Swiss-Prot record:
The chain holds residues 1093 to 1400 of 1620 of the full protein. Neuronal receptor tyrosine kinase that is essentially and transiently expressed in specific regions of the central and peripheral nervous systems and plays an important role in the genesis and differentiation of the nervous system. Also acts as a key thinness protein involved in the resistance to weight gain: in hypothalamic neurons, controls energy expenditure acting as a negative regulator of white adipose tissue lipolysis and sympathetic tone to fine-tune energy homeostasis. It comes from Homo sapiens (Human). Phosphorylated at tyrosine residues by autocatalysis, which activates kinase activity. In cells not stimulated by a ligand, receptor protein tyrosine phosphatase beta and zeta complex (PTPRB/PTPRZ1) dephosphorylates ALK at the sites in ALK that are undergoing autophosphorylation through autoactivation. N-glycosylated. Changing residue 142 to T: In NBLST3; somatic mutation. This is ALK tyrosine kinase receptor.
Length: 308
């Protein structure tokens, strides 16, 4: 029964909140994925009539290995032990019925990459998205990243597809919602269930793909790329290049151009996140204060977003 250790007390499955299977109702499939399903559901505590708890339910496929099972359990542990408004909450688990459930904060606005793509200013459907919407999301995630850093957790896979939004409209809050990669390295010493084609090399600094060195400065680099993803409104990093081209480009000093219409101050922040020497990269407290400076500048927040 493997333990998990964070900040830096210890826990195990025994410390997960086991919710009675009979209390959980699945409403709809929310996409899914290749390994496991995600549903919108309800937990009817205690059971009642209502107001029940709205949740996202992650399933473990019932045909899986012992290692898969431990991996699923580990994800539960990692997530439950966080306490940050910019990190998705784990509501509990349902491990004593099959298939196994993890129950997470329902994030109604979906993943960040998809949200951006789906809400890009278009006309027909008008411009209900502006520069400050983008800056707030960047601050939200910076805030969560800072909490990981201060508690010495390396995420390893910061990326818009791994961030989620509480809702689509104004008032949305962006949160980090995926810890699969962190879990994997925690479990073996390395990327055992992956391989090279599965690495997020486009979000990795040179010391990371070259040496397998990860520190909180490697998340900083990843964050820079996230920013570009946000300010490009959900484009793939290094638009024309493959993984290898990117690894060659970045190694030789190459860096992405600013996204269309990106204010200089925001771009400056990305370029500092991508300094070659990790020691030259800002930590998350500096990144936050910088994104707040951008927030205060009318010339940045008054800038129009492109219309594709
Ligand atoms: N807490 C949540 N609320 C709403 N949607 C979610 C939540 N967690 C994941 N999803 C979405 O459900 C789908 C499947 O998730 P999954 O395949 O496990 O991907 P990931 O590894 O990025 O979490 C994706 O579209 C994902 O963004």
């Amino acid at each position: 029964n493997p333990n998990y250790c964070f900040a830096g007390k210890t826990s195990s499955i025994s410390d997960l909140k086991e919710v009675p299977r009979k209390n959980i109702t699945l409403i709809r499939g929310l996409g899914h994925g290749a390994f496991g399903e995600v549903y919108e559901g309800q937990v009817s505590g205690m059971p009642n009539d209502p107001s029940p708890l709205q949740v996202a339910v992650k399933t473990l496929p019932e045909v899986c290995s012992e290692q898969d099972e431990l991996d699923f359990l580990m994800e539960a542990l990692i997530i439950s032990k966080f306490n940050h408004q910019n990190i998705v909450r784990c509501i509990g688990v349902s491990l004593q019925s099959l298939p196994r459930f993890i129950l997470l904060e329902l994030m109604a606005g979906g993943d960040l990459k998809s949200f951006l793509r789906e809400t890009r200013p278009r006309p027909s459907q008008p411009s209900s998205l502006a520069m400050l919407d983008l800056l707030h999301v960047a601050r939200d995630i910076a805030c969560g990243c800072q909490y990981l850093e201060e508690n010495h957790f390396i995420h390893r896979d910061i990326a818009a597809r791994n961030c989620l939004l509480t809702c689509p409209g104004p008032g949305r809050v962006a949160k980090i919602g995926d810890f699969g990669m962190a879990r994997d390295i925690y479990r073996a010493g390395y990327y055992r269930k992956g391989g090279c084609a599965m690495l997020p090399v486009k979000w990795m600094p040179p010391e990371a793909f070259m040496e397998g060195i990860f520190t909180s400065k490697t998340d900083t680099w990843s964050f820079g790329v996230l920013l570009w993803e946000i300010f490009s409104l959900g484009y793939m990093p290094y638009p024309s290049k493959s993984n290898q081209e990117v690894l060659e480009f970045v190694t030789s000093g190459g860096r992405m151009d600013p996204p269309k219409n990106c204010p200089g101050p925001v771009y400056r922040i990305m370029t500092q996140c991508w300094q070659h020497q990790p020691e030259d990269r800002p930590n998350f407290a500096i990144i936050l204060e910088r994104i707040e400076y951008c927030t205060q500048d009318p010339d940045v927040i008054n800038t129009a977003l492109p219309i594709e």
